[PDB]
């Protein structure tokens, strides 16, 4: 009974409905892949590796995880219905490195920057 990570978000599901929106294009087009190149996305362009990161209570904690890795996947294979969809999961993913972690930590200080810049992208969208 050594730990274990739990599956991770489901990144496809046939009886979703779901479109192809210029926003969504957008989403992932432009704001995905700017946020991934960025010098802090590294910890979250793949679901948390609690196992690999000796973080034990992780998913005690966090019981909606996000990470950018599974955005990524849902926008490329179309899974969701509107961009709003989108945002409430980058919204997840920081609000958990939040809830987890503390003020002044590293990997918080990490995620405020990319929150700051994935809000400055998504100020404007396409129609």
Not at 9 to 19: A, G
Not at 95 to 101: D, F, K, L, M, P
Not at 102 to 109: A, M, T
């Amino acid at each position: 009974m050594g730990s274990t990570n739990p599956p991770p978000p489901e990144t496809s599901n046939p009886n979703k409905p779901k479109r192809q929106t210029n926003q969504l294009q957008y989403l992932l087009r432009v704001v995905l892949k700017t946020l991934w190149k960025h010098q802090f996305a590294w910890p979250f362009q793949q679901p948390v590796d609690a196992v690999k990161l000796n973080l034990p209570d992780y998913y005690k904690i966090i019981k909606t995880p996000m990470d950018m890795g599974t955005i990524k996947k849902r926008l490329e294979n179309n899974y969701y219905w509107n961009a709003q969809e989108c945002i409430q999961d980058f919204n997840t993913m920081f609000t958990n490195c939040y809830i987890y972690n503390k003020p002044g930590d590293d990997i918080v200080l990490m995620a405020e920057a990319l929150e700051k810049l994935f809000l400055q992208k998504i100020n404007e969208l396409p129609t």
